[PDB]
Write a protein that binds this ligand. Structure first.
Ligand SMILES: CN(CCCOc1ccc(Cc2ccccc2)cc1)CCC(=O)O
Ligand SMILES: [Yb+3]
Ligand SMILES: [Yb+3]
Ligand SMILES: [Yb+3]
Length: 607
Protein backbone atom coordinates (compact mmCIF):
# COMPACT_ATOMS: atom_id res chain seq x y z
CA UNK A 1 0.00 0.00 0.00
CA UNK A 2 1.37 3.44 -0.97
CA UNK A 3 0.42 5.64 1.97
CA UNK A 4 1.67 8.81 0.20
CA UNK A 5 -0.67 8.47 -2.80
CA UNK A 6 -4.43 8.85 -3.07
CA UNK A 7 -4.57 7.34 -6.59
CA UNK A 8 -5.97 3.86 -7.51
CA UNK A 9 -3.09 1.45 -6.81
CA UNK A 10 -1.23 -0.66 -9.38
CA UNK A 11 -3.40 -3.67 -8.40
CA UNK A 12 -6.45 -1.73 -9.71
CA UNK A 13 -5.05 -0.05 -12.83
CA UNK A 14 -1.72 1.04 -14.22
CA UNK A 15 -0.70 4.01 -16.33
CA UNK A 16 1.38 2.75 -19.30
CA UNK A 17 2.02 6.10 -21.03
CA UNK A 18 1.63 9.86 -20.72
CA UNK A 19 1.38 12.19 -23.62
CA UNK A 20 1.78 15.71 -22.22
CA UNK A 21 0.82 18.74 -24.36
CA UNK A 22 1.23 21.96 -22.48
CA UNK A 23 2.16 25.58 -22.77
CA UNK A 24 4.34 27.47 -20.26
CA UNK A 25 2.75 30.81 -19.38
CA UNK A 26 5.28 32.99 -17.56
CA UNK A 27 2.77 35.86 -17.33
CA UNK A 28 0.41 33.78 -15.24
CA UNK A 29 3.00 31.30 -13.86
CA UNK A 30 0.84 28.45 -15.12
CA UNK A 31 1.35 25.33 -17.12
CA UNK A 32 -1.77 24.65 -19.15
CA UNK A 33 -2.65 21.73 -21.36
CA UNK A 34 -3.62 18.11 -21.58
CA UNK A 35 -2.34 14.99 -19.89
CA UNK A 36 -3.40 11.96 -21.98
CA UNK A 37 -2.91 8.87 -19.81
CA UNK A 38 -3.05 5.41 -21.37
CA UNK A 39 -4.39 3.35 -18.47
CA UNK A 40 -4.57 -0.42 -18.26
CA UNK A 41 -7.20 -2.00 -16.05
CA UNK A 42 -5.89 -4.70 -13.71
CA UNK A 43 -9.44 -5.60 -12.73
CA UNK A 44 -12.57 -7.02 -14.25
CA UNK A 45 -15.50 -4.58 -14.67
CA UNK A 46 -13.57 -1.42 -13.74
CA UNK A 47 -15.82 1.67 -13.89
CA UNK A 48 -13.87 4.41 -12.22
CA UNK A 49 -10.47 5.30 -11.00
CA UNK A 50 -8.68 7.81 -8.82
CA UNK A 51 -5.68 10.05 -9.63
CA UNK A 52 -3.53 12.26 -7.45
CA UNK A 53 -3.72 16.01 -7.96
CA UNK A 54 -2.44 19.01 -5.93
CA UNK A 55 -3.57 22.63 -6.67
CA UNK A 56 -4.60 21.70 -10.21
CA UNK A 57 -7.51 23.30 -12.00
CA UNK A 58 -9.32 20.65 -14.08
CA UNK A 59 -11.18 21.99 -17.13
CA UNK A 60 -12.47 18.64 -18.40
CA UNK A 61 -11.83 14.91 -18.91
CA UNK A 62 -12.30 13.33 -22.32
CA UNK A 63 -12.55 9.61 -23.13
CA UNK A 64 -13.63 8.29 -26.56
CA UNK A 65 -14.06 11.86 -27.73
CA UNK A 66 -16.63 12.77 -25.07
CA UNK A 67 -16.54 14.57 -21.71
CA UNK A 68 -17.02 12.39 -18.68
CA UNK A 69 -17.89 12.89 -15.06
CA UNK A 70 -15.14 13.38 -12.51
CA UNK A 71 -14.98 14.76 -8.96
CA UNK A 72 -12.23 16.20 -6.79
CA UNK A 73 -12.20 15.14 -3.16
CA UNK A 74 -11.37 17.35 -0.21
CA UNK A 75 -7.72 18.34 0.12
CA UNK A 76 -5.69 16.01 2.33
CA UNK A 77 -2.97 18.46 3.18
CA UNK A 78 0.42 17.71 1.54
CA UNK A 79 -1.13 14.77 -0.42
CA UNK A 80 -3.29 17.09 -2.57
CA UNK A 81 -6.79 16.21 -3.70
CA UNK A 82 -8.02 12.88 -5.11
CA UNK A 83 -9.60 13.00 -8.55
CA UNK A 84 -12.18 10.33 -9.22
CA UNK A 85 -13.01 9.74 -12.91
CA UNK A 86 -16.10 7.86 -14.09
CA UNK A 87 -15.30 5.68 -17.04
CA UNK A 88 -17.92 5.73 -19.77
CA UNK A 89 -17.59 1.95 -20.44
CA UNK A 90 -16.65 -0.77 -17.94
CA UNK A 91 -13.17 -2.17 -18.60
CA UNK A 92 -12.16 -5.80 -18.55
CA UNK A 93 -8.84 -6.91 -17.13
CA UNK A 94 -5.88 -5.77 -19.30
CA UNK A 95 -8.02 -3.46 -21.39
CA UNK A 96 -6.44 -0.09 -22.15
CA UNK A 97 -8.00 3.29 -22.68
CA UNK A 98 -6.79 6.80 -23.16
CA UNK A 99 -7.98 9.44 -20.71
CA UNK A 100 -7.34 13.03 -21.77
CA UNK A 101 -7.37 15.49 -18.89
CA UNK A 102 -7.36 19.26 -19.55
CA UNK A 103 -5.69 21.03 -16.65
CA UNK A 104 -3.83 24.04 -15.35
CA UNK A 105 -1.27 24.32 -12.55
CA UNK A 106 -1.38 26.85 -9.66
CA UNK A 107 1.42 29.44 -9.45
CA UNK A 108 2.00 27.94 -6.00
CA UNK A 109 2.66 24.44 -7.41
CA UNK A 110 4.98 22.76 -4.91
CA UNK A 111 6.59 21.03 -7.95
CA UNK A 112 7.67 24.27 -9.64
CA UNK A 113 9.81 27.33 -9.10
CA UNK A 114 9.12 30.31 -11.39
CA UNK A 115 11.99 32.68 -11.53
CA UNK A 116 11.80 36.30 -12.62
CA UNK A 117 14.56 37.64 -14.94
CA UNK A 118 16.36 39.29 -11.98
CA UNK A 119 16.67 35.87 -10.27
CA UNK A 120 18.56 34.41 -13.28
CA UNK A 121 22.21 34.87 -14.42
CA UNK A 122 21.35 36.72 -17.66
CA UNK A 123 18.75 39.02 -16.06
CA UNK A 124 16.91 39.24 -19.41
CA UNK A 125 14.60 36.21 -19.22
CA UNK A 126 12.56 34.26 -16.77
CA UNK A 127 13.15 30.59 -15.93
CA UNK A 128 11.10 27.63 -14.75
CA UNK A 129 12.20 24.36 -13.21
CA UNK A 130 10.48 21.31 -11.71
CA UNK A 131 11.29 18.94 -8.91
CA UNK A 132 8.83 16.05 -8.63
CA UNK A 133 10.54 13.72 -6.21
CA UNK A 134 9.01 12.58 -3.97
CA UNK A 135 5.33 13.37 -4.42
CA UNK A 136 5.15 16.66 -6.39
CA UNK A 137 4.32 15.30 -9.83
CA UNK A 138 0.61 15.54 -8.82
CA UNK A 139 1.26 19.32 -8.53
CA UNK A 140 2.06 19.42 -12.27
CA UNK A 141 -0.45 16.99 -13.74
CA UNK A 142 -2.99 14.36 -12.66
CA UNK A 143 -1.33 10.95 -12.22
CA UNK A 144 -0.95 7.88 -10.12
CA UNK A 145 1.76 9.63 -8.04
CA UNK A 146 3.45 6.52 -6.70
CA UNK A 147 6.73 4.94 -7.75
CA UNK A 148 4.93 1.56 -7.89
CA UNK A 149 3.72 2.53 -11.41
CA UNK A 150 6.10 2.91 -14.41
CA UNK A 151 5.18 4.56 -17.67
CA UNK A 152 6.76 5.84 -20.85
CA UNK A 153 6.00 9.37 -22.02
CA UNK A 154 6.06 11.83 -24.86
CA UNK A 155 5.58 15.56 -24.57
CA UNK A 156 5.05 18.76 -26.53
CA UNK A 157 5.88 21.93 -24.60
CA UNK A 158 5.16 25.46 -25.98
CA UNK A 159 7.48 28.18 -24.70
CA UNK A 160 8.39 31.76 -25.72
CA UNK A 161 10.57 31.21 -28.78
CA UNK A 162 13.59 32.89 -27.20
CA UNK A 163 13.58 30.24 -24.47
CA UNK A 164 14.55 26.52 -24.48
CA UNK A 165 12.57 23.61 -22.96
CA UNK A 166 14.28 20.47 -21.71
CA UNK A 167 12.90 17.36 -20.10
CA UNK A 168 13.87 13.95 -18.62
CA UNK A 169 13.63 12.42 -22.08
CA UNK A 170 15.21 12.36 -25.46
CA UNK A 171 14.83 15.60 -27.40
CA UNK A 172 12.78 15.05 -30.46
CA UNK A 173 12.95 18.41 -32.25
CA UNK A 174 11.42 21.89 -32.18
CA UNK A 175 9.04 23.96 -34.32
CA UNK A 176 7.27 27.28 -34.24
CA UNK A 177 3.96 27.02 -32.50
CA UNK A 178 1.15 27.07 -35.18
CA UNK A 179 -1.19 28.73 -32.69
CA UNK A 180 1.29 31.55 -31.81
CA UNK A 181 4.48 32.45 -33.73
CA UNK A 182 6.07 34.18 -30.76
CA UNK A 183 6.48 30.60 -29.33
CA UNK A 184 8.23 27.31 -29.99
CA UNK A 185 7.06 23.79 -29.36
CA UNK A 186 9.78 21.45 -28.12
CA UNK A 187 9.17 17.71 -28.37
CA UNK A 188 10.41 14.83 -26.18
CA UNK A 189 10.25 11.07 -25.92
CA UNK A 190 11.06 8.78 -23.02
CA UNK A 191 10.84 5.19 -24.30
CA UNK A 192 12.05 3.57 -21.00
CA UNK A 193 9.24 3.09 -18.46
CA UNK A 194 9.82 5.30 -15.44
CA UNK A 195 8.08 6.19 -12.17
CA UNK A 196 6.37 9.60 -12.49
CA UNK A 197 8.69 11.23 -9.90
CA UNK A 198 11.33 11.22 -12.71
CA UNK A 199 9.28 13.51 -14.99
CA UNK A 200 11.22 16.83 -15.20
CA UNK A 201 10.94 20.13 -17.11
CA UNK A 202 13.17 23.19 -17.32
CA UNK A 203 12.40 26.25 -19.43
CA UNK A 204 14.96 29.04 -19.72
CA UNK A 205 17.69 30.81 -21.70
CA UNK A 206 19.78 27.67 -21.93
CA UNK A 207 22.89 26.87 -23.94
CA UNK A 208 24.79 23.59 -24.25
CA UNK A 209 28.34 22.43 -24.60
CA UNK A 210 29.42 18.88 -25.41
CA UNK A 211 31.71 17.31 -22.75
CA UNK A 212 31.64 13.63 -23.70
CA UNK A 213 30.35 11.26 -26.38
CA UNK A 214 26.88 11.08 -24.76
CA UNK A 215 26.86 14.22 -22.60
CA UNK A 216 25.98 17.86 -23.07
CA UNK A 217 26.15 20.27 -20.18
CA UNK A 218 23.25 22.79 -20.14
CA UNK A 219 23.05 26.10 -18.21
CA UNK A 220 22.67 29.80 -18.83
CA UNK A 221 25.47 31.14 -21.00
CA UNK A 222 27.44 32.55 -18.07
CA UNK A 223 27.88 29.12 -16.40
CA UNK A 224 28.64 26.96 -19.45
CA UNK A 225 32.45 27.09 -19.52
CA UNK A 226 32.82 26.63 -15.77
CA UNK A 227 30.33 23.75 -15.82
CA UNK A 228 31.96 21.92 -18.74
CA UNK A 229 35.26 21.84 -16.83
CA UNK A 230 33.81 21.05 -13.44
CA UNK A 231 32.01 17.97 -14.75
CA UNK A 232 34.58 16.72 -17.26
CA UNK A 233 34.95 13.37 -15.40
CA UNK A 234 31.34 12.48 -16.30
CA UNK A 235 32.06 10.15 -19.22
CA UNK A 236 34.80 8.37 -17.30
CA UNK A 237 32.25 7.95 -14.48
CA UNK A 238 29.58 6.56 -16.83
CA UNK A 239 32.04 3.92 -18.13
CA UNK A 240 32.86 2.73 -14.57
CA UNK A 241 29.15 2.76 -13.71
CA UNK A 242 28.40 0.61 -16.78
CA UNK A 243 31.07 -1.81 -15.70
CA UNK A 244 29.52 -2.05 -12.23
CA UNK A 245 25.87 -1.87 -13.25
CA UNK A 246 25.57 -3.21 -16.75
CA UNK A 247 24.57 -1.24 -19.84
CA UNK A 248 23.38 2.33 -19.53
CA UNK A 249 19.93 2.08 -21.18
CA UNK A 250 18.97 5.74 -21.40
CA UNK A 251 20.73 6.92 -24.59
CA UNK A 252 21.95 10.34 -23.45
CA UNK A 253 23.37 11.45 -20.12
CA UNK A 254 23.17 15.27 -20.11
CA UNK A 255 23.63 17.64 -17.17
CA UNK A 256 21.63 20.75 -16.39
CA UNK A 257 23.17 23.25 -13.99
CA UNK A 258 20.27 25.03 -12.33
CA UNK A 259 20.00 28.50 -10.82
CA UNK A 260 21.17 28.69 -7.16
CA UNK A 261 17.68 28.08 -5.68
CA UNK A 262 17.71 24.45 -6.79
CA UNK A 263 16.85 22.67 -3.49
CA UNK A 264 19.19 19.68 -3.79
CA UNK A 265 22.71 18.69 -4.87
CA UNK A 266 21.36 16.63 -7.75
CA UNK A 267 18.24 14.98 -9.12
CA UNK A 268 18.72 11.88 -11.31
CA UNK A 269 16.07 12.83 -13.91
CA UNK A 270 16.55 10.31 -16.74
CA UNK A 271 18.60 11.64 -19.70
CA UNK A 272 19.06 14.93 -17.91
CA UNK A 273 20.49 15.04 -14.38
CA UNK A 274 19.79 18.33 -12.60
CA UNK A 275 22.57 19.71 -10.36
CA UNK A 276 23.15 22.66 -8.03
CA UNK A 277 25.54 25.43 -9.14
CA UNK A 278 27.07 25.06 -5.64
CA UNK A 279 29.07 22.17 -7.22
CA UNK A 280 31.09 24.66 -9.26
CA UNK A 281 34.06 24.68 -6.90
CA UNK A 282 36.57 25.20 -9.73
CA UNK A 283 38.50 21.98 -9.18
CA UNK A 284 36.08 19.05 -9.69
CA UNK A 285 36.23 18.35 -5.92
CA UNK A 286 32.41 17.88 -5.50
CA UNK A 287 32.13 15.47 -8.44
CA UNK A 288 30.92 12.67 -6.11
CA UNK A 289 27.50 14.20 -6.63
CA UNK A 290 27.82 13.48 -10.35
CA UNK A 291 28.91 9.87 -9.55
CA UNK A 292 25.79 9.66 -7.39
CA UNK A 293 23.31 10.92 -9.99
CA UNK A 294 24.96 8.71 -12.66
CA UNK A 295 24.59 5.65 -10.39
CA UNK A 296 20.82 6.27 -10.09
CA UNK A 297 20.56 5.37 -13.78
CA UNK A 298 20.66 1.79 -12.37
CA UNK A 299 19.77 1.97 -8.69
CA UNK A 300 16.59 4.06 -8.57
CA UNK A 301 15.72 4.59 -12.24
CA UNK A 302 15.89 0.96 -13.42
CA UNK A 303 15.32 -0.71 -10.02
CA UNK A 304 12.95 1.57 -8.13
CA UNK A 305 11.53 1.77 -4.61
CA UNK A 306 7.90 0.55 -4.71
CA UNK A 307 6.85 3.09 -2.12
CA UNK A 308 8.73 5.85 -0.31
CA UNK A 309 9.00 3.76 2.86
CA UNK A 310 11.71 1.87 0.89
CA UNK A 311 13.62 4.99 -0.30
CA UNK A 312 16.80 3.55 1.28
CA UNK A 313 16.80 0.98 -1.53
CA UNK A 314 17.28 3.89 -3.91
CA UNK A 315 19.82 5.84 -1.88
CA UNK A 316 21.84 3.19 -0.07
CA UNK A 317 22.70 1.34 -3.24
CA UNK A 318 23.35 4.57 -5.10
CA UNK A 319 25.74 5.83 -2.39
CA UNK A 320 27.42 2.40 -2.50
CA UNK A 321 27.92 2.62 -6.27
CA UNK A 322 28.91 6.29 -6.00
CA UNK A 323 31.71 5.45 -3.57
CA UNK A 324 32.91 2.61 -5.81
CA UNK A 325 33.12 5.02 -8.77
CA UNK A 326 35.18 7.43 -6.68
CA UNK A 327 37.13 4.45 -5.40
CA UNK A 328 38.01 3.42 -9.02
CA UNK A 329 39.05 6.95 -9.98
CA UNK A 330 40.89 7.95 -6.83
CA UNK A 331 41.72 4.77 -4.94
CA UNK A 332 40.36 2.40 -2.35
CA UNK A 333 41.74 4.56 0.49
CA UNK A 334 39.56 7.40 -0.71
CA UNK A 335 36.47 5.19 -0.92
CA UNK A 336 37.12 4.32 2.76
CA UNK A 337 37.69 8.00 3.62
CA UNK A 338 34.30 8.92 2.09
CA UNK A 339 32.55 5.96 3.68
CA UNK A 340 33.83 6.97 7.13
CA UNK A 341 32.75 10.55 6.51
CA UNK A 342 29.29 9.33 5.68
CA UNK A 343 29.13 7.51 9.03
CA UNK A 344 29.89 10.86 10.71
CA UNK A 345 27.01 12.42 8.73
CA UNK A 346 24.80 9.56 9.94
CA UNK A 347 25.90 10.35 13.55
CA UNK A 348 24.92 13.98 12.97
CA UNK A 349 21.48 13.09 11.66
CA UNK A 350 20.76 10.60 14.45
CA UNK A 351 21.83 13.25 16.97
CA UNK A 352 19.59 15.88 15.34
CA UNK A 353 16.38 13.83 15.23
CA UNK A 354 17.20 11.89 18.37
CA UNK A 355 18.28 8.28 18.63
CA UNK A 356 14.76 6.94 19.13
CA UNK A 357 13.15 9.08 16.42
CA UNK A 358 11.16 7.16 13.72
CA UNK A 359 12.96 9.03 10.89
CA UNK A 360 16.24 7.42 11.94
CA UNK A 361 14.87 4.00 10.98
CA UNK A 362 16.12 2.57 7.66
CA UNK A 363 12.65 1.54 6.49
CA UNK A 364 10.34 4.38 7.55
CA UNK A 365 6.51 4.43 7.81
CA UNK A 366 5.30 7.54 5.98
CA UNK A 367 1.61 7.14 6.99
CA UNK A 368 0.56 10.71 7.56
CA UNK A 369 4.13 12.06 7.15
CA UNK A 370 5.04 14.63 4.54
CA UNK A 371 8.08 12.96 2.89
CA UNK A 372 9.84 16.41 2.69
CA UNK A 373 9.65 16.62 6.49
CA UNK A 374 11.26 13.15 6.86
CA UNK A 375 14.04 13.61 4.26
CA UNK A 376 17.61 13.41 5.62
CA UNK A 377 20.96 11.58 5.35
CA UNK A 378 19.57 8.51 7.10
CA UNK A 379 18.32 6.53 4.06
CA UNK A 380 21.67 7.45 2.36
CA UNK A 381 24.16 6.64 5.08
CA UNK A 382 22.32 4.03 7.12
CA UNK A 383 21.59 2.38 3.78
CA UNK A 384 25.24 2.67 2.74
CA UNK A 385 26.45 1.43 6.16
CA UNK A 386 24.24 -1.66 5.80
CA UNK A 387 25.61 -2.53 2.41
CA UNK A 388 29.21 -1.73 3.43
CA UNK A 389 28.77 -4.02 6.50
CA UNK A 390 27.38 -6.83 4.24
CA UNK A 391 30.25 -6.38 1.79
CA UNK A 392 32.69 -6.94 4.65
CA UNK A 393 30.63 -9.83 6.00
CA UNK A 394 30.26 -11.58 2.67
CA UNK A 395 33.89 -11.52 1.42
CA UNK A 396 34.71 -8.06 0.10
CA UNK A 397 33.91 -5.44 -2.54
CA UNK A 398 34.40 -7.66 -5.55
CA UNK A 399 31.97 -10.35 -4.28
CA UNK A 400 29.35 -7.81 -3.24
CA UNK A 401 29.56 -5.97 -6.59
CA UNK A 402 28.66 -9.27 -8.28
CA UNK A 403 25.53 -9.17 -6.13
CA UNK A 404 24.81 -5.53 -6.97
CA UNK A 405 25.01 -6.24 -10.71
CA UNK A 406 22.87 -9.38 -10.39
CA UNK A 407 20.35 -7.30 -8.30
CA UNK A 408 20.04 -4.58 -10.98
CA UNK A 409 19.52 -7.22 -13.70
CA UNK A 410 16.95 -9.07 -11.60
CA UNK A 411 14.79 -6.03 -10.84
CA UNK A 412 15.34 -3.78 -13.90
CA UNK A 413 12.13 -1.96 -14.95
CA UNK A 414 10.43 -3.02 -11.69
CA UNK A 415 9.46 -1.46 -8.40
CA UNK A 416 10.48 -3.39 -5.30
CA UNK A 417 10.32 -3.44 -1.49
CA UNK A 418 12.92 -4.11 1.20
CA UNK A 419 11.73 -7.76 1.39
CA UNK A 420 12.17 -8.25 -2.35
CA UNK A 421 15.72 -7.05 -1.85
CA UNK A 422 16.42 -9.20 1.24
CA UNK A 423 14.95 -12.21 -0.51
CA UNK A 424 17.18 -11.84 -3.48
CA UNK A 425 20.18 -11.11 -1.24
CA UNK A 426 19.60 -14.49 0.50
CA UNK A 427 18.98 -16.30 -2.79
CA UNK A 428 22.21 -14.90 -4.30
CA UNK A 429 24.29 -15.64 -1.21
CA UNK A 430 22.64 -19.02 -0.44
CA UNK A 431 26.04 -20.59 0.29
CA UNK A 432 26.58 -17.86 2.91
CA UNK A 433 23.17 -17.96 4.54
CA UNK A 434 24.70 -18.69 7.96
CA UNK A 435 26.70 -15.47 7.68
CA UNK A 436 23.49 -13.67 6.64
CA UNK A 437 21.57 -15.10 9.64
CA UNK A 438 24.02 -13.41 12.01
CA UNK A 439 22.81 -10.01 10.77
CA UNK A 440 20.47 -8.29 13.17
CA UNK A 441 17.82 -7.55 10.52
CA UNK A 442 15.21 -6.18 12.87
CA UNK A 443 17.70 -3.63 14.23
CA UNK A 444 19.22 -2.65 10.85
CA UNK A 445 15.88 -2.30 9.00
CA UNK A 446 13.36 -1.20 11.64
CA UNK A 447 15.08 0.18 14.74
CA UNK A 448 15.92 3.84 15.26
CA UNK A 449 19.39 5.26 15.89
CA UNK A 450 22.86 4.29 14.85
CA UNK A 451 23.19 0.82 13.37
CA UNK A 452 23.94 -2.00 15.78
CA UNK A 453 27.35 -2.65 14.14
CA UNK A 454 29.86 -0.15 12.69
CA UNK A 455 31.80 -1.38 9.65
CA UNK A 456 35.60 -1.42 9.48
CA UNK A 457 37.18 1.59 7.84
CA UNK A 458 40.67 2.23 6.65
CA UNK A 459 41.85 5.40 8.48
CA UNK A 460 44.85 6.56 6.39
CA UNK A 461 43.37 9.74 4.89
CA UNK A 462 41.18 10.43 7.93
CA UNK A 463 43.98 10.43 10.53
CA UNK A 464 45.45 13.86 9.74
CA UNK A 465 41.95 15.43 9.93
CA UNK A 466 41.20 13.93 13.31
CA UNK A 467 44.67 14.85 14.60
CA UNK A 468 44.30 18.48 13.62
CA UNK A 469 40.70 18.65 14.92
CA UNK A 470 41.83 17.19 18.25
CA UNK A 471 44.74 19.69 18.48
CA UNK A 472 42.26 22.52 18.06
CA UNK A 473 39.73 21.12 20.61
CA UNK A 474 42.30 20.41 23.30
CA UNK A 475 44.17 23.69 22.72
CA UNK A 476 44.14 26.34 25.46
CA UNK A 477 44.77 30.00 24.82
CA UNK A 478 48.54 29.55 25.18
CA UNK A 479 48.52 26.91 22.38
CA UNK A 480 46.84 29.16 19.81
CA UNK A 481 50.17 30.65 18.71
CA UNK A 482 51.43 27.26 17.53
CA UNK A 483 48.80 26.99 14.79
CA UNK A 484 50.03 28.13 11.35
CA UNK A 485 49.02 27.98 7.64
CA UNK A 486 51.53 25.08 7.28
CA UNK A 487 49.06 22.90 9.26
CA UNK A 488 46.96 22.61 6.04
CA UNK A 489 49.96 21.90 3.78
CA UNK A 490 49.28 18.28 2.97
CA UNK A 491 45.47 18.34 3.23
CA UNK A 492 43.30 18.03 0.13
CA UNK A 493 40.01 20.02 0.01
CA UNK A 494 38.36 16.77 1.08
CA UNK A 495 40.47 16.56 4.21
CA UNK A 496 39.88 20.25 5.04
CA UNK A 497 36.18 19.55 4.81
CA UNK A 498 36.55 16.50 7.07
CA UNK A 499 38.71 18.45 9.54
CA UNK A 500 35.92 21.03 9.69
CA UNK A 501 33.26 18.27 10.07
CA UNK A 502 35.15 16.68 12.95
CA UNK A 503 35.53 20.01 14.68
CA UNK A 504 31.90 20.94 14.02
CA UNK A 505 30.83 17.77 15.84
CA UNK A 506 32.24 19.27 19.07
CA UNK A 507 30.99 22.84 18.45
CA UNK A 508 30.96 25.24 20.09
CA UNK A 509 34.68 25.96 20.38
CA UNK A 510 35.90 29.08 22.25
CA UNK A 511 35.44 32.28 20.18
CA UNK A 512 39.12 33.02 20.56
CA UNK A 513 39.99 29.65 18.91
CA UNK A 514 37.67 30.30 15.94
CA UNK A 515 39.14 33.80 15.42
CA UNK A 516 42.63 32.32 15.45
CA UNK A 517 41.50 29.67 12.90
CA UNK A 518 40.50 32.47 10.52
CA UNK A 519 43.75 34.30 11.34
CA UNK A 520 46.01 31.37 10.32
CA UNK A 521 43.84 29.43 7.82
CA UNK A 522 41.70 32.21 6.25
CA UNK A 523 38.72 29.92 5.79
CA UNK A 524 36.66 33.02 4.94
CA UNK A 525 38.37 33.06 1.53
CA UNK A 526 37.42 29.53 0.56
CA UNK A 527 34.50 29.33 -1.84
CA UNK A 528 34.06 25.57 -1.87
CA UNK A 529 30.41 25.34 -0.71
CA UNK A 530 30.94 22.24 1.49
CA UNK A 531 33.89 23.73 3.31
CA UNK A 532 32.36 27.18 3.56
CA UNK A 533 29.07 25.77 4.89
CA UNK A 534 30.76 23.79 7.70
CA UNK A 535 33.11 26.69 8.49
CA UNK A 536 30.23 29.25 8.81
CA UNK A 537 28.30 26.77 10.94
CA UNK A 538 31.30 26.43 13.24
CA UNK A 539 31.56 30.26 13.42
CA UNK A 540 27.88 30.83 14.19
CA UNK A 541 27.65 28.02 16.74
CA UNK A 542 30.79 29.39 18.45
CA UNK A 543 29.06 32.83 18.60
CA UNK A 544 31.21 34.87 16.23
CA UNK A 545 29.11 37.91 15.22
CA UNK A 546 31.40 38.76 12.28
CA UNK A 547 30.20 35.51 10.60
CA UNK A 548 26.53 36.60 10.84
CA UNK A 549 26.47 38.49 7.48
CA UNK A 550 28.54 35.71 5.83
CA UNK A 551 26.05 33.07 7.02
CA UNK A 552 23.00 35.17 6.00
CA UNK A 553 24.46 35.76 2.58
CA UNK A 554 25.25 32.07 1.94
CA UNK A 555 21.78 31.03 3.24
CA UNK A 556 20.01 33.28 0.73
CA UNK A 557 22.27 33.58 -2.36
CA UNK A 558 21.92 29.85 -2.94
CA UNK A 559 19.04 27.57 -1.91
CA UNK A 560 20.43 24.08 -1.58
CA UNK A 561 18.55 22.84 1.49
CA UNK A 562 21.63 20.95 2.76
CA UNK A 563 23.19 24.37 3.35
CA UNK A 564 20.28 26.85 3.61
CA UNK A 565 18.32 24.97 6.30
CA UNK A 566 21.10 24.47 8.87
CA UNK A 567 22.51 27.98 8.30
CA UNK A 568 19.09 29.50 9.05
CA UNK A 569 18.62 27.16 12.04
CA UNK A 570 22.05 28.08 13.42
CA UNK A 571 21.44 31.85 12.84
CA UNK A 572 18.06 31.49 14.64
CA UNK A 573 19.73 29.61 17.51
CA UNK A 574 22.24 32.46 18.01
CA UNK A 575 20.60 35.32 19.97
CA UNK A 576 22.61 38.02 18.18
CA UNK A 577 21.33 36.89 14.75
CA UNK A 578 17.96 35.44 15.70
CA UNK A 579 15.93 38.47 14.58
CA UNK A 580 17.82 38.95 11.31
CA UNK A 581 17.37 35.25 10.52
CA UNK A 582 13.60 35.52 10.85
CA UNK A 583 13.51 38.86 9.04
CA UNK A 584 15.66 37.55 6.21
CA UNK A 585 13.48 34.49 5.81
CA UNK A 586 10.29 36.63 5.80
CA UNK A 587 11.77 38.95 3.17
CA UNK A 588 12.95 36.15 0.83
CA UNK A 589 10.05 33.74 1.47
CA UNK A 590 7.98 34.78 -1.61
CA UNK A 591 10.93 34.31 -3.97
CA UNK A 592 12.13 31.03 -2.48
CA UNK A 593 11.52 27.55 -3.74
CA UNK A 594 8.16 26.42 -2.29
CA UNK A 595 9.47 23.30 -0.49
CA UNK A 596 12.52 25.20 0.89
CA UNK A 597 10.17 28.03 2.00
CA UNK A 598 8.01 25.50 3.78
CA UNK A 599 10.86 23.70 5.56
CA UNK A 600 12.86 26.79 6.60
CA UNK A 601 9.49 28.10 7.86
CA UNK A 602 8.96 25.03 10.05
CA UNK A 603 12.60 25.05 11.15
CA UNK A 604 12.37 28.70 12.30
CA UNK A 605 8.83 28.20 13.72
CA UNK A 606 7.65 31.12 11.67
CA UNK A 607 4.12 31.60 10.33
C1 LIG B 1 16.52 15.12 -5.27
N1 LIG B 1 16.65 14.41 -3.99
C2 LIG B 1 15.42 13.73 -3.53
C3 LIG B 1 14.21 14.70 -3.42
C4 LIG B 1 13.20 14.34 -2.31
O1 LIG B 1 13.05 12.88 -2.39
C5 LIG B 1 12.50 12.27 -1.32
C6 LIG B 1 12.38 10.90 -1.34
C7 LIG B 1 11.81 10.25 -0.26
C8 LIG B 1 11.38 10.96 0.84
C9 LIG B 1 10.73 10.26 2.05
C10 LIG B 1 11.75 9.53 2.96
C11 LIG B 1 12.52 10.24 3.87
C12 LIG B 1 13.41 9.56 4.69
C13 LIG B 1 13.53 8.17 4.59
C14 LIG B 1 12.75 7.48 3.69
C15 LIG B 1 11.86 8.16 2.88
C16 LIG B 1 11.50 12.33 0.85
C17 LIG B 1 12.07 13.00 -0.21
C18 LIG B 1 17.81 13.49 -3.94
C19 LIG B 1 18.10 12.87 -5.29
C20 LIG B 1 19.32 11.93 -5.21
O2 LIG B 1 19.49 11.16 -4.24
O3 LIG B 1 20.12 11.93 -6.15
YB1 LIG C 1 12.46 11.77 -33.93
YB1 LIG D 1 13.66 -16.61 0.43
YB1 LIG E 1 49.20 25.56 28.39
Amino acid sequence: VDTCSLASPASVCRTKHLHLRCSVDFTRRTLTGTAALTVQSQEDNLRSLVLDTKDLTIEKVVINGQEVKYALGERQSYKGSPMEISLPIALSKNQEIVIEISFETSPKSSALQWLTPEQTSGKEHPYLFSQCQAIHCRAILPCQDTPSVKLTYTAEVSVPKELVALMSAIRDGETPDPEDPSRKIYKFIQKVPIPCYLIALVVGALESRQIGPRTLVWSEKEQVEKSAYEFSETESMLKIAEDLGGPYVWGQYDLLVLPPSFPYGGMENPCLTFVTPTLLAGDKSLSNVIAHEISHSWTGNLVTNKTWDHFWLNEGHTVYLERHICGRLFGEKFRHFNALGGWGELQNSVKTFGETHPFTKLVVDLTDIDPDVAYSSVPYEKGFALLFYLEQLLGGPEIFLGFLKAYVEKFSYKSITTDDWKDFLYSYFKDKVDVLNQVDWNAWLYSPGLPPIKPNYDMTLTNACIALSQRWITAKEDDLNSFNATDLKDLSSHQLNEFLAQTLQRAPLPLGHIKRMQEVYNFNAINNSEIRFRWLRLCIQSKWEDAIPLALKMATEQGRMKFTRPLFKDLAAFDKSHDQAVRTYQEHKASMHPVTAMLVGKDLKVD
